[PDB]
Amino acid sequence: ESVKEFLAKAKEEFLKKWESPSQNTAQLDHFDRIKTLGTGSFGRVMLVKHKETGNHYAMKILDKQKVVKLKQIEHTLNEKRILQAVNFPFLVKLEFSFKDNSNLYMVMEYVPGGEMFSHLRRIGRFSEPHARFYAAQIVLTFEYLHSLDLIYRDLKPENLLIDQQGYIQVTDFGFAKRVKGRTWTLCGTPEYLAPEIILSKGYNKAVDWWALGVLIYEMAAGYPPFFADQPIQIYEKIVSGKVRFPSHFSSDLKDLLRNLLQVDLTKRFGNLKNGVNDIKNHKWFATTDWIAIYQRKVEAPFIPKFKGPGDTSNFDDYEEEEIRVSINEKCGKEFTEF
Numbered sequence: 001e002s003v004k005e006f007l008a009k010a011k012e013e014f015l016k017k018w019e020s021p022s023q024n025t026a027q028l029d030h031f032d033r034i035k036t037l038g039t040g041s042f043g044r045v046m047l048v049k050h051k052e053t054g055n056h057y058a059m060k061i062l063d064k065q066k067v068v069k070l071k072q073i074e075h076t077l078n079e080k081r082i083l084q085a086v087n088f089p090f091l092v093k094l095e096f097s098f099k100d101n102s103n104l105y106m107v108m109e110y111v112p113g114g115e116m117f118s119h120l121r122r123i124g125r126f127s128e129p130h131a132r133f134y135a136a137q138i139v140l141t142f143e144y145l146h147s148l149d150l151i152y153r154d155l156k157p158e159n160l161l162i163d164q165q166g167y168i169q170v171t172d173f174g175f176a177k178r179v180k181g182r183t184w185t186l187c188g189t190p191e192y193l194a195p196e197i198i199l200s201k202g203y204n205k206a207v208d209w210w211a212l213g214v215l216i217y218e219m220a221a222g223y224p225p226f227f228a229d230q231p232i233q234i235y236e237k238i239v240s241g242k243v244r245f246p247s248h249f250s251s252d253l254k255d256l257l258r259n260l261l262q263v264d265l266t267k268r269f270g271n272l273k274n275g276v277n278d279i280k281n282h283k284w285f286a287t288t289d290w291i292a293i294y295q296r297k298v299e300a301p302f303i304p305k306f307k308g309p310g311d312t313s314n315f316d317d318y319e320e321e322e323i324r325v326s327i328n329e330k331c332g333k334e335f336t337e338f
């Protein structure tokens, strides 16, 4: 009942913000630009500093004309409406949002420890206890999101930032969506796509649990289970129902992964009658104190090295491009609700 009441309150609080979203809570000239942390086909993430408070933030900047072109309108509206409504220890917090003639802006807490991806590639692979510490946080985060009828749809090491305490903060809600029942959009990253996405089925939260299997495998092995030069070759392996495990994997890990990387979504852990408890009660998680993880009372496997809230050392170097704002409003109608 403790968990039931926790999730009932979480849903109440989410729905209140979901039905009355915040809007237009800062503006661009409230900030100084520091550094580009990442660049994409329709947006960027910038380290910025608030000129009055001195606080640092990560500012996600989306070009409205490119969002339209790349058919991401609904997705960008999803991202912001969800982020301003959620509240969980392992989700990056949205602090402000606004738009101008050219761009959409989401101003997030800055997490200076960098992407899990960097640390994993630097060390090679994580020990099972280390992988399990991160995986437990994703299990609880999906328990939370799925109870809100949210599917995340972009789990991968690049989207998990490591904070000052060594805990995870999930970033990038660009493909997150509120879904009752099924949804159909092809999105995600190839290595992490569930078979039912590849096969163009109506799919549900089970795709997040598949992706968790991929993530745990990659954390523990150093590479993802389905790998190839071309996406179509990756997709053939995903749909095949065949995975090879390193001999150093524990039997418990292999058993969990066979049940998360279950190609038949009606048999996949997280999508059965017992829901998330099939995962939480699995032998691979026998040492996990779920409440202690939630309360951030567990000592982390490692603390990222960084010098302060403005340190960018754990992010990499990108060409510094203008944040241009047109004299004329672009795509006003499309983004009215943002």
Ligand SMILES: NC(=O)c1ccc(N2CCOCC2)nc1
Pocket: 037, 038, 039, 045, 058, 092, 108, 109, 110, 111, 112, 161, 171, 315
């Ligand atoms: N909330 C943050 O501190 C943050 C920092 C960097 C970042 N990314 C986007 C993808 O490219 C690499 C940099 N996203 C979010």
